[PDB]
RNA sequence: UCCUUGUCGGGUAAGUUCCGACCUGCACGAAUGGCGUAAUGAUGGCCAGGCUGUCUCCACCCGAGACUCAGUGAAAUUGAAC
């Protein structure tokens, strides 16, 4: 019934402008058996994203995902060619921004993994039916790229 | 194999060419030889310093033609032409 609501962290490239919903078809890959791309003829699927402040090439912003499908939120965030930072598999080729400093680099290059984390879950007790809220700490990878990408768009934009 | 010439740096105010690198890269490929290689090359491509009419923008001058006179004297083409 799409009761439990999901949130997610996540970070992409590009100067986003508003948020708003994806709803596109997805199934199997023509080709690669480890990609799960965009198909018309797919199985249908609903994503919502926000934003909650941008950066120089780069964003942080919060979503909700309802199917917990098998890598749904990283197409549906590409399928608008905005693919999330540090993603091997279905992020785009590596593009840092014009007048990066080293230390920037290296924090991409250091931020190997795929950009993503879930802060918020909000479940219903089985025998009491009263609502449970709790929140994730954002992890020591998160905060640091944050923080890079925070001095360096007050430096150079600035 | 593609997308945002791939995009960051040098080179430039601005670089579809050049240089070591991120990756989603592995085909070639190890005597139909592979990697590096000092020196060498009227060898491919790029950059820098001096230099200049290459150029903005050409101007003048020196000589040989082009022009007139005297002599000799072709050419390809041509159905006919007011």
Known sequence: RREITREYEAV????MTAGGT???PISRHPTKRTHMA?????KPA????????????????RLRLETGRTHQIRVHMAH?????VGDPVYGGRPRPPKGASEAFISTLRKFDRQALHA???R????????????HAPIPQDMVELIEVMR???????D
Do not use: Q
């Open 123 to 134: 479940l219903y007790h089985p025998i009491s039916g009263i609502e449970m809220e709790w």
């Open 46 to 61: 609903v994503t919502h994203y926000r934003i909650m402040e941008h950066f120089r090439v780069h964003t942080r912003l």
């Open 80 to 84: 608008i060619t905005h693919p999330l």
């Open 151 to 157: 001095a360096d768009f007050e430096e150079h934009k």
């Open 22 to 24: 994806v709803d596109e």
């Open 12 to 15: 992409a490239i590009g100067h």
């Open 38 to 42: 965009v198909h018309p003829m797919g």
């Open 119 to 121: 802060t918020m879950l």
